[PDB]
Amino acid sequence: ATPLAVNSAASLWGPYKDIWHKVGNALWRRQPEAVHLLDKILKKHKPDFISLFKNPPKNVQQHEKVQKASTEGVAIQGQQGTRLLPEQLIKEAFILSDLFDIGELAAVELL
């Protein structure tokens, strides 16, 4: 059952709306099935709340793979294999990397 649980701190939106909607259903809609998800989601994302709004940092071992994403490709959560990335999306990822100070894979998973 391994390895895949390694990228799961790079996507800068999806996991945060996944928390917010399930906090909404567990609190404001009082939904009981959501309490048995909330405990596990809060135990998972406690680091994220302990460092509010903090980016995942830049890394040469992401930077290589983003610059090579047109030839070596990049593996993405939910997708089976490597996606080849166009030069456009590669250059957009380096722009978002230096515009927000986010890690190069987090700029790709955000794009």
**Given the rule CB under 8 A, which residues bind other proteins?**
1-6, 8, 44, 46-47, 57, 75, 80-82
Min CB(74)–other proteins separation in Å: 9
Q: Residue 72: CB partners within 8 Å, gap ≥ 6? A: 65, 82
- Kindly tell me which of 65 and 90 has the beta carbon lying closer to other proteins: 65
**How far, in Å, CA of 42 to CA of 61, rounded?**
29
Min CB(68)–other proteins separation in Å: 14
- Kindly tell me which of 29 and 60 has the beta carbon lying closer to other proteins: 60
- Kindly tell me which of 32 and 80 has the beta carbon lying closer to other proteins: 80
**How far, in Å, CA of 99 to CA of 106, rounded?**
13
Min CB(3)–other proteins separation in Å: 4
- Kindly tell me which of 23 and 75 has the beta carbon lying closer to other proteins: 75
At 100, which amino acid appears?
Answer: F
99's tokens: 């515009």
Q: Angle formed by the axes of helices 60-67 and 87-100, to 10°?
A: 150
